[PDB]
Amino acid sequence: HTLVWGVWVNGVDQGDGRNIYIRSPPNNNPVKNLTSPDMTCNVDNRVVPKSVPVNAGDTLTFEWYHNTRDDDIIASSHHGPIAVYIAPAASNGQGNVWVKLFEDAYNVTNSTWAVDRLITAHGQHSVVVPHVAPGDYLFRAEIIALHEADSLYSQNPIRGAQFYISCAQITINSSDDSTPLPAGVPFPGAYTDSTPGIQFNIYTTPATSYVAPPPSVWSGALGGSIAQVGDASLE
Ligand SMILES: *[C@@H]1O[C@H](CO)[C@@H](O)[C@H](O)[C@H]1NC(C)=O
């Protein structure tokens, strides 16, 4: 159970984004139905009034939270990977538009999942804005909690992979468009029962062998991290 409070750009807080530049759902409940239009941008996907201005090469930081800002972020139980996708705002998430910019599953050295490191990073993970066509965009942040993913939601609806999905409205102003956005995967659609990383037993399988759901990170992806860039408590 976790939600996006807002974003930082180049380490500067853009302010509370909820229902403003984040297409926020009403609560932090997970999406579990892989075929639901809810997989696109969660259960209240509608245009919101603001779009965050950024330039190619800027660091865009998602800030997640559980109940209040800078709290415990997401229950420690919710071990799993984090991905960020992008699609032109024109799509509104429909069709084969979502290009992956970031993937973090398990870090072997630290022996931590992406979610473990998200909590330490106070809900903050980042991507560098790629050299795509200036225009309006959706950045779709995705946390998969695997603590009930031994079962498939299609077979047993009270279990399954849990998706925490948040779409930020981002306007890329300044970019040379030297890496124009390629063909994307659809959501819903990219993830099925058969897809690697959807069904997994974190208790009996070693995390080292976890493979995260395709697609792979686009060659045009410019960087990303799970790491505090900003201190919310100083505001
Ligand atoms: C999952 O989503 C599909 C497509 O919208 C829907 O028809 C199906 O009823 C859903 N499954 C459940 C159990 O709600």
Ligand SMILES: [Cu+2]
């Ligand atoms: Cu939860």
